[PDB]
Amino acid sequence: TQERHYEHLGRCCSRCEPGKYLSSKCTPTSDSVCLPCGPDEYLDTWNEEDKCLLHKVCDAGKALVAVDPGNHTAPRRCACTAGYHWNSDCECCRRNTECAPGFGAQHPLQLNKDTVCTPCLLGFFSDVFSSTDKCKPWTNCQGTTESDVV
Amino acid sequence: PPCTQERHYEHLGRCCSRCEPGKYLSSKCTPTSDSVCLPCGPDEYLDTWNEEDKCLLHKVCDAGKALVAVDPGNHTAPRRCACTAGYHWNSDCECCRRNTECAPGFGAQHPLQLNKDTVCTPCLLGFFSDVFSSTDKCKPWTNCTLLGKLEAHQGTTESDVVCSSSMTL
Ligand SMILES: [Cl-]
Ligand SMILES: [Cl-]
Ligand SMILES: [Cl-]
Ligand code: NA
Ligand code: NA
Secondary structure (H helix, E strand, C coil), X not given: CCCCEEEECCEEEECECCCEEEEECCCCCCCCEEEECXXXXXXXCCECXXXXXXXXCXXXXXXXXXXXXXXXXXXXXXXXXXXXXXXXXCCXXXXXXXXXXXXXECCCEECECCCCEEECCCCEECCCCECCXXXXXXXXXXXXXXXXXX | CCXXXXXXXXXXXXXXXXXXXXXXXXXXXXXXXXXXXXXCCCXXXXXXXXXXXXXXECCCCCHXXXXXXXXXXXXXXXXXXXXXXXXXXECCCCEEEECCCECCCEEECCCEECCCCCCEEECCCCEECCCCECCCCCEECCCHHHHCCCEEECCCCXXXXXXXXXXXX
């Protein structure tokens, strides 16, 4: 089987499980020697690789941070920091749209996506530009969509 | 005043400091003591400099929609969700959709972005992809020159170079 095995010395020797690299090919005495990937390294396949793949750095200069895989078996994702979203056209993190007064941010907020803004409905207001703040209820004592009752 | 509304509250003729995001007002200030501000409990949050006697409860990210919480333990901000690995939030359906798979000869642009669809790009000469995958980038060809071997099979953007096992003089 090509999936679990490679051929060497006229026999089918076993490939390395995801998370492990092929340190030594099989011998006339031994099957393959497979060792765990080091820090920030991975292999997500049954393989014959002589080294693990290194996770791409998430560039802090682009406002990116790492999303932890909690394993050595998955490729690692990055994401824009809270309040920012990845734009594939600029290939850059943009500030999330601030919903103007009279509008509120829709929840739940989606990581790495821009804010959806919706108008405050009767009985609710928003007095700030914010990419996170929902519309707030009027305090019970005239209010508008942009201002609380006085 | 100079008791700044942004960071303070008035109580019994005194200027007292509001609690930081992530903490709630356990007890108001006294003549010889500050505000007692204590952390919000598990699953709870407050996202403003506040004078709240209790914190708000986080809603779970909807697993039925294939969403997962990011930094679920954050007490200082409203919760953010993201589609599970291999899926992206689609704004048209407001839902998680399976990531685009890059065909053989194409690779995923790295680093992969959480909650975003895979962007697929052609493998350059010297690199290949033999599978449909929303994660795999193009892999460099095996280097037979490095080993001083001849090639048994020419590489393509869809298949790896294969080195000969034969020796030459
Ligand atoms: Cl990676
Ligand atoms: Cl707006
Ligand atoms: Cl929340
Ligand atoms: Na607003
Ligand atoms: Na591919």
